[PDB]
């Protein structure tokens with residue numbers, strides 16, 4: 172069977188990843204590029220050393236939020252008109268707080284601004300066991316059986332052990348662990364009209380058997396919300412691509428070092444798809460411990476996402492949906 176890898180995309184992803192890691196004087200980085208319609212793995216790139224894309228568990232951080240928001244919409248726990256109070260709070264020593272105090276936000280705003288408070292409130296409308304099953308259905312804790320040695324399953328703690336604060340902090344991506352490949356896979360539920368794809372290392376003549384996570388209508392509405400992330404007002408404007416609308420999500424995760432979360436060491440993540448309305452490509456970028464030129468997901472991982480996505484669309488012959496201006 173024809174290998175799914177596209178050499179030009181692989182080269183592009185590798186070169187842009189290593190350029191970004193150098194520019195930000197980071198420890199390491201990883202990129203996954205997927206066919207958004209059939210789940211072909213087009214590129215898997217790493218900084219020198221092991222195949223971190225498949226071997227390394229990371230916390231998804233705010234890259235989990237699109238799924239929580241989609242689930243809440245899908246189940247009718249919220250809608251596109253609700254305006255949620257998003258003031259911060261604590262339970263005991265644990266804060267539930269955003270980068271800024273947003274007094275209130277609608278679901279679009281929660282996505283756009285990356286509101287931990289907003290996402291936690293939507294998650295809290297579901298029971299713990301329901302959320303556990305949901306995360307497991309996204310593939311968290313479920314090995315890909317890629318064939319690569321040292322491949323990780325990720326980690327999903329048994330729901331019977333969860334404190335109520337833990338369900339909340341999981342909704343903005345603490346505690347959950349998965350590889351970047353497992354995380355990129357999850358995004359196929361949003362691009363492939365609600366249906367999670369298994370991913371493939373060979374070209375597929377038709378979409379393989381998947382599993383429905385969301386209604387098609389939910390997936391379509393969520394993709395539209397995610398375009399807010401790359402437009403003025405969003406966290407991820409650095410990932411906007413000339414000629415296209417891009418649905419994306421940023422993540423900035425405190426690193427866990429010496430038994431505690433560090434306040435000044437982070438992992439920067441940017442995951443997105445285009446064309447947003449009718450997606451063809453998913454690009455996932457993570458940069459571990461940037462020490463120069465910033466640390467926010469949008470600022471650090473946005474620019475390489477932009478280059479890799481723009482280049483991939485061109486390589487694949489996908490036409491711009493709006494006039495070019497660059």
Ligand SMILES: *C(=O)[C@@H](NC(=O)/C(=N\OCC(=O)O)c1csc(N)n1)[C@@H]1NC(C(=O)O)=C(C=C)CS1
Pocket residue numbers: 230231232233234269270284285287343344345346406421422423424425426432434467468469
């Ligand atoms: C999303 O990733 C979410 N991030 C956090 O809540 C985390 N840390 O915040 C940064 C800090 O210094 O406290 C976090 C989640 S899991 C983990 N280990 N850390 C929000 N998203 C973004 C973003 O890029 O979209 C943020 C940007 C600064 C922080 S809040």
